[PDB]
Design a protein around this ligand. Sequence first.
Ligand SMILES: */C=C\C(=O)N1CCN(CC2CC2)c2cc(C(=O)OC)ccc21
Length: 287
Amino acid sequence: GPLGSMENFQKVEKIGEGTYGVVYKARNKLTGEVVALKKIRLSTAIREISLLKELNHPNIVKLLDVIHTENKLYLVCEFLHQDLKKFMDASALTGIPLPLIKSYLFQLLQGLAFCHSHRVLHRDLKPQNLLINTEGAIKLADFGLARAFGEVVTLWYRAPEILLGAKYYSTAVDIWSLGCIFAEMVTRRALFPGDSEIDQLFRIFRTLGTPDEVVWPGVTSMPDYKPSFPKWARQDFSKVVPPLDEDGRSLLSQMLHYDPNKRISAKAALAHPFFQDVTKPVPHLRL
Ligand SMILES: */C=C\C(=O)N1CCN(CC2CC2)c2cc(C(=O)OC)ccc21
């Protein structure tokens, strides 16, 4: 078995918890490069991961290297300046400026359209794995594998078809997660902050109404659907995202359609009128 493969990286800071391991800010001992290092404590996933090394896009965090040594798996990523959760917390008193929200949403839709055009799903979009830099960019990170391998799981961004037991995800799950993040940037509160699967499901139901066959054909036959679910009425989007103009509200409503077949795709969303005046502002970052 392999050893000595990682003495070329000196760990500088602990910067989060990825989808399968802890992530450090590290410094390439040899080249001086500053990177983000995911350590997965341990294949068909050795190939599914290495395919992500080819998935290069301005709005996807660059996967530089996979280092499989000594019953541990390392992912070497480019390092970005801040993640969206921290920036949202830092902007709690003022709010992220709406043009910057719109830039960030637009860029993430571009990243997803690229990912989805390659039939790659993220599966677990969260403010914590959206990374931003000083230049105005935002990038997708920590893609969830179809094969899980290797804190507490956040459920707040989970699409309802996942919660309802759907065995096969579509790209629509990522559009749902990003809609939730969009709303959270605008209102400065999480849209659906459940603390269990059923609390998550029912928080969605209380806001968007309990889905039935009318709005979601097939919902009542899903593995975890129960006829005994409470029947809540749908609230109005004027109540859910007050600061958002009608263009933003209509886009968000389309990202949160219950039926994954009705949910807007990333590429369709790019053409939505909400982006006809999109710009690329600079965040104010305290690093
Ligand atoms: C290559 C490391 C990697 O896989 N990721 C995804 C995990 N994270 C953060 C994790 C969600 C808490 C992460 C962060 C960065 C970064 O630059 O943070 C400042 C880069 C890559 C990765």
